[PDB]
Amino acid sequence: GSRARVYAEVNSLRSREYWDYEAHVPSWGNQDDYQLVRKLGRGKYSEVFEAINITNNERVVVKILKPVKKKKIKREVKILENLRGGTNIIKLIDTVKDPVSKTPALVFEYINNTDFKQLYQILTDFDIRFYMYELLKALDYCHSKGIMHRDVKPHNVMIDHQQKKLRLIDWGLAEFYHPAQEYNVRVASRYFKGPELLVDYQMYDYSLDMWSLGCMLASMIFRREPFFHGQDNYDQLVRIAKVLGTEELYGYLKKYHIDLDPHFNDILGQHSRKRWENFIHSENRHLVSPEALDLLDKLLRYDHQQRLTAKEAMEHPYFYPVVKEQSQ
């Protein structure tokens, strides 16, 4: 079918206990050590709070899980434990329960995030290179650990723009990659869904995250956020095809023997592939370079298996100024 070009066998080469999250037995500490201070956020599966550990005054984040989802809890816990110490991955400090209700929660390191909508309108060329490089470190790490994030988007990339700290958060959709495994396509945010998801291709891999990263890069260098702004999942693919081209979409589908939902026939139209320079204008020109466009062109590709890996992206000339500053 399709396989990842990198890290394809790494889970099979590890002990089964590494990836068999259903067999994982977390050690649940006591949530009574934590005082909730402020609600940050809330999703269908969890609610997130700033908190203080009253035993040592440490400020933390507590994510309270909805307890009915036992397999998904084990998955997120095991993934976070496997990733501990990875560069720019949010640090899981502990797994705790309310000692009476037994409702589980995750305790994370605190980061003071700069709201992305405002931030992405004031980044410099160097800043974009720097933060994209830092995010790539996290993705290369998790991919090397056999894990796809599957929900890369600005809201899951915390950036403290004062300390220049970045953390990739919300591992609740992440999964272990196993070659030939068919995965649920109902992952990622609409605007960050790769074409593979939108055409119901289940044999995807780490490269899904590289599409999402490309979407973020485009939004930063062009100042159009989100970059591909679909109204629903059907329209999302139309928005992509109006840039990447319809003949090019059909070549991708043919290569992977992908069946297209016939509702698309009435909405895709006919679109030439657009030059990335078409998105430049006076408001973003200072963020766009030949390097940036070359990198973007190699990320925002229909063919998931031809997109750059996180490592190949990190090795692109676009990041040379960051690497050089990092050593001098």
Any binding-site annotation on 63?
A: yes
Helices within the chain (DSSP H only):
16-19, 70-82, 116-119, 125-144, 195-198, 207-222, 233-244, 246-255, 290-299, 310-314, 320-327
Q: Which is nearer to ligand QWN, 141 or 318 (CB)?
A: 141
- Least distance between Cl ion and beta carbon 179 (Å): 14
State the catalytic residue, choosing from 20, 32, 98, 151: 151
Q: Give the C-alpha separation, 249 to 242, whole Å.
A: 10
- Least distance between Cl ion and beta carbon 64 (Å): 23
Q: Which is nearer to ligand QWN, 71 or 324 (CB)?
A: 71
151 is catalytic: yes
Any binding-site annotation on 86?
A: no
Q: What is the DSSP string of 224-278?
A: -SSSS--SSHHHHHHHHHHHH-HHHHHHHHHHTTPPPPGGGGGT----PPPPGGG
Q: Which is nearer to ligand QWN, 135 or 237 (CB)?
A: 135
Which of Cl ion, ligand QWN, none does 184 bind, CB closer than 5 to 8 A by kind? Cl ion
Q: Which residues bind ligand QWN (CB under 6 A)?
A: 40, 48, 61, 63, 90, 108, 111, 169-170
Q: Given candidates 30, 184, 202, 231, which one binds Cl ion under the rule CB under 5 A?
A: 184
Q: Which is nearer to Cl ion, 59 or 186 (CB)?
A: 186
Which of ligand QWN, Cl ion, none does 52 bind, CB closer than 5 to 8 A by kind? none
Which of Cl ion, ligand QWN, none does 108 bind, CB closer than 5 to 8 A by kind? ligand QWN
Pick the closest to residue 272 from 237, 301, 298, 248 (CA basis): 248
Pick the closest to residue 219 from 210, 232, 207, 228 (CA basis): 228
Question: Residue 30 CB: number of other CB atoms within 10 A?
Answer: 12
Q: Give the C-alpha separation, 92 to 135, whole Å.
A: 18
The first and second tokens of residue 189, run together, are 């945010």
- Least distance between ligand QWN and beta carbon 41 (Å): 6
Q: How would you classify the pairing of strands 104-109 and 29-30? A: unpaired
Q: Which is nearer to ligand QWN, 75 or 129 (CB)?
A: 75
Confirm if 95 and 104 have CB atoms less than 8 A apart: yes
112 binds Cl ion (CB under 5 A): no
176 binds Cl ion (CB under 5 A): no
Any binding-site annotation on 41?
A: yes
Per CB under 5 A, which of residues 145..174 are in contact with Cl ion? Answer: none
Pick the closest to residue 129 from 228, 225, 221 (CA basis): 221
Could you list the residues known to form a binding site for ATP, using ranges: 40-48, 63
Per CB under 5 A, residues contacting Cl ion are 183-184
Could you list the residues known to form a binding site, using ranges: 40-48, 63
The set of catalytic residues is 151
